Structure formats: structure tokens, C-alpha cells
Symmetry: C3
């Protein structure tokens, strides 16, 4: 990324409120505001070095928590019953997530770095691994950017949760929309019981941390199809319609009975005039 927008150095303390709430249809969701919970829950995005203090309130009548992948947390923020890190009905707790930049340890080794595509979810609704909470919709994405990472025009979250996408009914999407040439970021998370294969028509990405290649030397596989299982997370950027043009470009699980039974959506890539050939 030279003149594309790139992430700055991180290092700020940030604060945020989150709620877990039962929804009217029986699902459960997270939100930054009461009455505005979503499934998936809202995107949290930070830079390496940032600390995030989340003031979490459980508005439900059963215990619930927040567990995160990837980021640094102490045991008091693991979100488990075992470590007394869950939240009673109506209660509030502050969870802290930290992130760090990569760098050389004293022994001359290289410490990895927090950056990546991650996710948060419940760990105590229905079972002590959060099986009911996850099923009901308590999951959401987290992005940690490294300094210099390329930033997108927009970010969409796609979760394969059992045999649904984002807890939707079969064959109801979601659909996402872009214009030819937009830089679109996809955060792809899987939950539940089953393995899946995520496929996008007309587009492809690098099987590495960022989903993009910095230059000619990266030997990573370039793919359009990727096996995933429960609690896996990856992400990538694509240039919408790059080399292929506008169209109603399908994305789906490529396990045949899964696509047949509704794990399908559309990436609607428009011309400037807003039209889509064949749609």
C-alpha cells in the first residue's frame, strides 16, 4: 500500500459499551446500544497496540459472557464460568482486550503480533462452551490492523453458523453491494457443528494473514474456495469486479447439500450507472 489508505501505528486506550440482549424472535445478539443488537454483532476494529475496555451489560435473564479469539486478555476476561468471567442476568462487567505489535524478544526470537481477523462470542449460554449462545446469534467480528495494512472501502461479515449464514433463513442472503473497483473486505467466520467451504464467484484472494500479497515473493496459494470449521476466522480484500466486470456474483458454501439447502448469497457488483448485467 503506497497511496491506498493504510492503518496508522496503534497505542490508544479505547472504551466501548456492549450489551447482550434477547431479541423478539428468540435469537440473542450483541450491540453497542440497547435495542440495537444485531446478528452478527457489531464489528470491533483496533490497531495493534490499542487497549479496549468494554463495559458489558447482560440484559438477558440467563448468564452470558464475551470471549474473544486472538487478542491479549487476562484470565479475568476469558469469558468462562470456570474463571468467574461470565455475567449474571442484569449484571455489568468490564472486559479488557489488549493488542501488541510484533517485535524482537530478548532471546533474539520474534514475537508474533496481534494483527488479524478474529471474532468474539458467548461462552456460557446453553453450555459452558456457549453452544446455545452461539446458536442463538451471540457472535461478531474483530479486526486488528497492523501499521501499514491496507484499509478497505467497506467491510462485510459472513458467518457460517451451522447451516445458516448469519442466522438467516435458507436462501435469504445476505446480499452485499459494491461498485466495480471498490476495495471490499470480507471477514469470514464459522461456528457450530459442521465444516464448510467458502467460495466466491469471479474473485480470489491470498491464503495468508491479510488475504493480499505485498509483492511478487509471497508464495501463498491464491484461492477462491476455503475449508473452515467451528471458530475459524480469516479475512481478505478484493477489488470488486477486477478483471471480470459487473454482475450478481454468487458466494456460497460449496458443500453441495449446503448450497442446495440455502447457504448462498450475492455479491452485487454494479456499474457506475447502478445496473448489473443479467440482473
Amino acid at each position: 500500500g503506497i497511496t491506498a489508505r493504510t492503518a496508522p501505528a496503534g497505542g490508544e486506550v479505547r472504551h466501548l459499551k456492549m450489551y447482550a440482549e434477547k431479541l423478539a424472535d428468540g435469537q440473542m445478539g450483541y450491540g453497542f446500544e440497547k435495542g440495537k443488537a444485531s446478528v452478527p454483532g457489531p464489528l470491533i476494529e483496533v490497531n495493534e497496540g490499542d487497549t479496549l475496555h468494554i463495559e458489558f451489560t447482560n440484559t438477558m435473564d440467563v448468564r452470558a459472557s464475551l470471549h474473544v479469539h486472538g487478542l491479549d486478555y487476562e484470565i479475568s476476561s476469558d469469558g468462562t464460568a470456570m474463571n468467574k468471567s461470565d455475567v449474571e442476568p442484569g449484571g455489568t462487567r468490564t472486559y479488557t482486550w489488549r493488542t501488541h505489535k510484533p517485535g524482537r524478544r530478548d532471546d533474539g526470537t520474534w514475537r508474533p503480533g496481534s494483527a488479524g481477523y478474529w471474532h468474539y462470542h458467548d461462552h456460557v449460554v446453553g453450555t459452558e462452551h456457549g453452544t446455545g449462545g452461539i446458536r442463538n446469534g451471540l457472535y461478531g467480528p474483530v479486526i486488528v490492523r497492523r501499521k501499514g495494512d491496507v484499509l478497505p472501502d467497506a467491510t462485510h461479515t459472513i458467518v457460517f453458523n451451522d447451516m445458516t449464514i448469519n442466522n438467516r433463513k435458507p436462501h435469504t442472503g445476505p446480499d452485499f453491494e459494491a461498485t466495480v473497483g471498490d476495495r471490499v473486505e470480507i471477514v469470514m467466520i464459522t461456528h457450530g457443528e459442521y465444516y464448510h467451504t467458502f467460495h466466491m464467484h469471479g474473485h480470489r484472494w491470498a491464503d495468508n494473514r491479510t488475504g493480499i500479497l505485498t509483492g511478487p515473493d509471497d508464495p501463498s496459494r491464491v484461492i477462491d474456495n476455503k475449508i473452515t470449521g467451528p471458530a475459524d476466522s480469516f479475512g481478505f480484500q478484493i477489488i470488486a469486479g477486477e478483471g471480470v466486470g459487473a454482475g450478481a456474483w454468487m458466494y456460497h458454501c460449496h458443500v453441495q447439500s449446503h448450497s442446495d439447502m440455502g447457504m448462498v448469497g450475492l455479491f452485487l457488483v454494479k456499474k457506475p450507472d447502478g445496473t448489473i448485467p443479467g440482473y
Copy 2:
């Protein structure tokens, strides 16, 4: 690759005919000529930069199509019913696949590049995701070479399609044959309903784009066993019998009930005299 044969720069327009045909036993296959359809379908191999105009004829009495992974195609060549890209019984359509080399975009980012191990398959027989067509044998491999890629002595295609290899009956192979020291390329594709693990005895490869390491700096895992799911594709080269000698070297799915029920074949690596110790 210094003095091994390496792929040249691409950039040619190529033309080819393909047919979909029902076979006498009830399967369905692609071929470059009528009466010579195979399962898997024939290998298509191009260099990055090439364009391929495929003049496709559906000789079957049901609609059928050709969808490809990885390569650049416009929406009119996606092979779906939705985009009116399938082919009626007896009909002909020209599908176009393009490929591009990697390079620097105007924004200073690096555009990936088409090269890889890919595949084509039907998208409309039995269901609108091609479940019946895929089951019946409408799939085949595609290789896109980058300039400088090492070329093999021979290429073999292994497809895990449900609980078959290449739609064969249990325990009937296929078997492949080589001589110690041959450079053998394997294209490995999975289709259907199930996950698998591809394993080869006596040999190993790099989990990256080419399946080979260019030099000492590539940190990719070297493996002999790899989980795959529907529509996954990867490929590699091995030197037959390198460091291990001649033998009837098994390859199989390593999921235990799958190997037990017949997802097994042999890589028959011969001495110059044509014999195989233990066989």
C-alpha cells in the same frame, strides 16, 4: 528452476472445443471430442496472460454448463442459470476464460495473479449448484502457469468425489506409474458432500501455491497429508522415489472408514528395469 524446463511468458489467445456427454453407464463427462469424454474431464493448461475461448456443446438431453474456479470470466461465462450462462440440450455456447499476470496497481498494491491449480465443473445438472452433474462426473482440472514455474514430466489428476476417486468403484485405483527420478505433478480436487484427508506414502510437498519451495526462506509447512473439502483444489510436484526408492507407494484418503471402504490407489514407482520391489 534453472535448467529444469520452466513455463514461458503467456499472452496467447487459444481456442478449444468441449462437449458434455452422457456416457453409456449413466455417468456424464466432458471431452475435447465427441465420443471421448472422460471422468475427470481433460486437463486444460494455460500460461498467465492467455485467453481461452471454449466452444462448448451440450450433447445431453438436459441443460448443462461449465463453471471455472480461479480464472477471470465475465458474468456471461459464470455457467449459472441465474445469469443465463448455461446451455440447453443440443446447444452450443462460447465460454471465455481469461488469465492475468500479477503486478503493481496504481495505488501501489500488488494484484495477485491467476496462476494456480484450479478446476471446472457443471453448475446446473440436478440442482442449480450442479450437484447431479458433479456427482455424475462433470468435473476436470485447470492449471495456470506463471512464467518461470517448473514444468513436470507428467501430470495426474486425483479427484475425491464423495466416497470415490475419480468416480471409480471402491478399491479400483486409479494407479499411476512413474520411474525413479521422474518429476510428477499431482492436481488434487475434492467435490461433493464430505471432507477428506489426502495422504501419499513415501513423498511430501510444500503447502503453498506450487507445492514446491523456491529456496531456503519459504516458511511453508512441508506435508504428506492435507484436509480438503468440496471444491478445494491444490497441486504439487514430487520427484518420484526421491530418497526412498522404487515401490508401490500408496495414496489414499486417511479418514479411516474412507480408506477401509476403498479410497485408495497406488503410485507405482519403478526402477529403470521396470520392476517394483515388493510387487
Copy 3:
């Protein structure tokens, strides 16, 4: 690794005895000594270049073998019935495993190198793919170090074998223990019928050969969750409690019904005083 301990150049001939034995409870295990078989079997660790002559005795009343992944072996040491490489009841056979360093071939290509996280298992108990032997506990880890690889304080082996960890009953661990700051190596192997997702709380690693990054240029995904299938093997090192502190840090399969039914253990990271907050 500058001043962390690093593996030396390999090249030695080594000798070792192994036994396969039935255990009192009906399982089957390997050991370096009679009466001391374990499940998983003992760790074998060598440097690239080493040769290992294993003098194997089958003390059981059914045929058994030793098959290895990754390492160089001739067909006479593949461990299969087909190649007459298994061992009758009460019998002895010498299996030979070799390893090689990476280097430039005559054609200018780069030959991979044996180094990695590998495993050995039976290939003839119950079926000719060793399904019964594997089920009963005939599996163990193998590590091949490359010169310069970072060495750990300790190595733990975690095997997802069907719906068990290391053939243990549900919810019985195993648990591993460390002190904050220890360099812990994990060898993670999967066997059987099912796919899994390996997850560790509070820790993460690089999805590459060593599980660690040498420096800022490696683009490998940093993860805490990884899909695996039968006969897959990977490994990594983590600094216990790095950035997160002491705690009873869970590891588990993240497939929800699997964790619910007992594929869970604890990574007990202690302060110097031996205590664990929340435990």
C-alpha cells in the same frame, strides 16, 4: 533464535528399541521398554540428516506395524501388509527412518527438507489401514528439527483421536502445566473418523512449518484455532502466559458438541509461587 537454544546440524546414526503391547484395559500402545507403553506413544525427536534404526518387537498376539509420516523410508519400512512390512505376533523387525536437509538439486530446484512435526502409527491392526490399531492407541509423535530451529523448554503431545484426546475418557484432560515465560512446544495430531478444530485460550501461533515467525516478513496467518482431519500433524511454540499472565487456560476442540462432550483440557500456567489466579 539468537541466544535461545537452537538445534545443531544433524547427521548421526541412531538406534532405538520399540515395542507394541496390549495394555491391561484393552488398549494398545507403543513404548521404548516392555511394560512402559503409553498412549500416545513416546516422542521420537531427531535432527535433519539423522538416520534412525528402530528395532521393533510386536509383543501382541495379532500382527502390527509402524508407519511414519514425513520421514524418508524405503518401501521395506512402509509398515503395510502389501509390502510385507508388518510384524507377526511375537516377531521383531528393524524399521529404518532417514531424514535429509534441504538443498539445491542439479536442475537448480530446491529439495524440501525432512524437518517438521510428524507422527507414527500402526497400519495393520483391525484393517489394512490400521483402523483398529489407531483406535486402540497405536500412535505417537515425531519431530525433525532443522539446524537453527528454536528448542523449547518442554514438548506436549495432543492427539484428537475420534472423540477423545489421547484416548482419555471425556472431560479428563489431559492437563499440562507451565510457569509464566516457559517456552512450550505443542505437537498436535488428529486420527480417526472426524474433523476437528483445535483452539487454545490466551495464546496463538503462526500457521507455518515451525508455528513461529522468524521475523517481520513472514506473511503467515497468526491463529488460535485450526481445522484438522485424520493423520494431520502440526506443531508450534508459545511463550506461556505471554501478554496474558497466569491462569487455567483452556484448550479444546471448538466443534461445539465435541467440547460439550468432553474434548477439553487445561493449560495450567502458574506464577513463580505456583499459584493460578481463579483456580
